[PDB]
C-alpha cells in the first residue's frame, strides 16, 4: 500500500475489461463475416 | 450599381471623357455614402452636425477619388491613343491614391494607395479585356 488514498484505478474494472475485449472480438467476427458474404454475393452477381 | 456600371463600360475608352468622369464620380460617391451610413450607424456621432459633416467628408473624399480616376484614365487613353491599354487605368488608379493621400494628408498613405489602387485599377482593365469573372456563373 503506497498510496495514502486508494486510487480510483488501483484495480482493473474487470466488467469493463471483459466488455471491451468482447466488443472487439464481436466486431472482428462480424467484419469477417460481412466481408465473406460480400465476396460471395459479388462473385455470384458477376457470374464468377 | 448595375446600371451605373453599364453606362461606364458602354462608352468607348479614351472618348466621351465627361461621361466617364460622371460615371466614376457617381460610383465613388455611392461608395462614400455606403461607408458613411455604416460609420454613422456603428460609431454614433456626438451630434447631428458631426454626423452630417462626417457623411460629407467621406462622400466627398470618395467622389473625389472616383472623379480623378475617371478623368485621368480617360485623358491618358485619349492622349496616348491607346483605348485598350491597362496602363491608362494604372495611371488613373494612382491619381486616386494621391487624392486619398491629400484628403487624409499622409504622404505614406498616398504612396501606398497609389500603388495598390493603381495595381487594382490595372487588373480591372485586364479583366475587362480578357473576360475575367469575379463572381463566376456556375457551369460544372
Amino acid at each position: 500500500k503506497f498510496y495514502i488514498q486508494e486510487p480510483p484505478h488501483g484495480s482493473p474494472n474487470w466488467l469493463k475489461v471483459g466488455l471491451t475485449l468482447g466488443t472487439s472480438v464481436f466486431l472482428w467476427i462480424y467484419l469477417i463475416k460481412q466481408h465473406n458474404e460480400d465476396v460471395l454475393e459479388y462473385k455470384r452477381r458477376n457470374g464468377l | 450599381a448595375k446600371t451605373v456600371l453599364r453606362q461606364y463600360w458602354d462608352i468607348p475608352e479614351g472618348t466621351e471623357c465627361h461621361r466617364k468622369t460622371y460615371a466614376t464620380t457617381s460610383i465613388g460617391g455611392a461608395a462614400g455614402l455606403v461607408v458613411s451610413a455604416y460609420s454613422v450607424a456603428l460609431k454614433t456621432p456626438t451630434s447631428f452636425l458631426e454626423g452630417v459633416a462626417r457623411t460629407g467628408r467621406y462622400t466627398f473624399t470618395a467622389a473625389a477619388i472616383g472623379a480623378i480616376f475617371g478623368l485621368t484614365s480617360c485623358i491618358s487613353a485619349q492622349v496616348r491613343e491607346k483605348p485598350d491599354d491597362p496602363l491608362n487605368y494604372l495611371i488613373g488608379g494612382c491619381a486616386g491614391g494621391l487624392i486619398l493621400g491629400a484628403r487624409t494628408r499622409s504622404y505614406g498613405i498616398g504612396a501606398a494607395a497609389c500603388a495598390y489602387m493603381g495595381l487594382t485599377a490595372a487588373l480591372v482593365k485586364m479583366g475587362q479585356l480578357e473576360g475575367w469573372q469575379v463572381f463566376a456563373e456556375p457551369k460544372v
Binding site: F2, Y3, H9, S11, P12 | -
Partner: protein, 320 residues
C-alpha cells in the same frame, strides 16, 4: 461508481445521507490560543472528523504516499523564514500566504466533500474565511506590498464565492499579552520573534472584520481561554444551536449535487489560484518551473496517474 450525474440520478442525493449532526465547524483564534486542542475535543465528543490546520504540506498529505515532499515542490515557502526575515526581498512572505490560502481552499474542499459524501460533520482549524487575518497583519506591519493584497483579494473573490460558509464558527479569544506569554513558553525560537503589534493586527482583523461578517451568516460562539478548557460546555453549546441563518437553509439536492461536482474535482477547485497575474512574489520563470516540474515527475509514484506507477508496485497496468 465515481460520483457524477449518473450516480446522482440513481439515488446518491446528499439529503439522504445528511442529518442534523451533519455540520461544518471551524475553530478560530490568535496564535497559541489552544484552538488546536479545542478542535480535537469537539470532534471526539461530537463524533466528527477532525482536520488538523492546513499547513505548507497539507496537499502532500492527501496525494501520493501522503508523506511531505521536499521544499522546492512547494515553491520554497517557509514559515520559519517569515519570522526570521518577514521583509526578505525574495518575496517569501506573500508567497507563503498565497500558498497557504490555496492549501486551505483545498482542505475546505476535502472537508465539504467528506460532509456531502458520508454525512459526517467535520472540524477545521481556521478556514478560507479567516485566512485573511494573517494577510491583514502582514500588510499592516509592512511585510507585504499593496499589490500582494490586491492579488490576494482577486483570488479570494473568484474562489470563496463557490463554497458554503461553516455551520458553526467557534472563536477562542485570548489577549495579546497572554498570547505573547504562551509563545515564549512554547519555546520555538522563530515564533518567539513574533511581535505584539503583529499579534494585535490579527486580533483586530478577527474582531473588526471576521466575527461581524460571519455573525451575519453563521453561528458564532466566543470563549475566553478559561471557558475553552470546558470542552463539554462548548459541545453542549453547539448542540443547542437553532441554526436559523446562512445559505445552508437554501440548499437542496440539485444545488448540493453541483457543489459536490466542484469539490471532488481538485483541479477545478484550484483553477483560479494560478490566475495569470504577474506578481513578482509568486511569479516563477520558465527555466525554473520547467526544471522543478521535471524533478517532480521523477519522484516515486509521480510520473503517471495513480495506479499506473510500476515503480511503486502497481500491477495489471496493461489491463488498466
Amino acid at each position: 461508481l465515481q460520483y457524477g450525474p449518473l450516480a446522482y440520478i440513481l439515488g446518491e442525493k446528499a439529503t439522504k445521507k445528511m442529518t442534523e449532526k451533519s455540520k461544518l465547524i471551524t475553530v478560530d483564534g490568535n496564535i497559541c490560543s489552544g484552538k488546536s486542542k479545542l478542535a480535537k475535543e469537539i470532534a471526539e465528543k461530537l463524533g466528527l472528523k477532525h482536520f488538523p490546520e492546513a499547513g505548507i504540506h497539507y496537499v502532500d498529505s492527501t496525494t501520493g504516499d501522503g508523506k511531505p515532499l521536499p521544499v522546492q515542490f512547494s515553491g520554497n515557502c517557509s514559515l520559519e523564514k517569515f519570522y526570521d526575515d518577514p521583509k526578505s526581498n525574495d518575496g517569501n512572505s506573500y508567497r507563503l500566504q498565497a500558498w497557504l490560502y490555496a492549501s486551505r481552499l483545498l482542505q475546505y474542499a476535502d472537508a465539504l466533500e467528506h460532509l456531502l459524501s458520508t454525512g459526517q460533520g467535520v472540524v477545521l482549524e481556521r478556514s478560507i474565511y479567516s485566512d485573511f487575518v494573517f494577510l491583514e497583519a502582514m500588510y499592516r506591519q509592512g511585510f507585504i506590498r499593496k499589490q500582494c493584497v490586491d492579488h490576494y483579494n482577486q483570488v479570494k473573490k473568484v474562489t470563496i464565492c463557490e463554497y458554503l460558509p461553516p455551520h458553526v464558527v467557534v472563536y477562542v479569544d485570548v489577549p495579546v499579552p497572554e498570547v505573547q506569554s504562551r509563545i515564549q513558553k512554547k519555546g520555538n525560537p522563530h515564533e518567539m520573534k513574533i511581535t505584539s503589534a503583529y499579534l494585535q493586527d490579527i486580533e483586530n482583523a478577527y474582531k473588526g472584520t471576521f466575527l461581524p461578517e460571519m455573525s451575519e451568516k453563521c453561528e458564532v460562539l466566543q470563549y475566553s481561554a478559561w471557558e475553552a478548557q470546558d470542552a463539554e460546555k462548548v459541545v453542549e453549546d453547539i448542540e443547542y444551536l437553532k441554526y436559523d441563518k446562512g445559505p445552508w437553509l437554501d440548499q437542496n439536492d440539485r444545488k448540493l449535487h453541483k457543489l459536490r461536482m466542484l469539490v471532488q474535482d481538485k483541479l477545478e477547485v484550484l483553477n483560479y489560484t494560478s490566475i495569470p497575474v504577474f506578481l513578482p512574489e509568486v511569479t516563477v520563470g520558465a527555466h525554473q518551473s520547467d526544471q522543478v516540474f521535471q524533478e517532480f515527475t521523477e519522484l516515486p509514484g509521480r510520473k503517471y496517474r495513480a495506479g499506473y506507477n510500476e515503480d511503486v508496485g502497481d500491477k495489471w497496468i496493461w489491463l488498466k
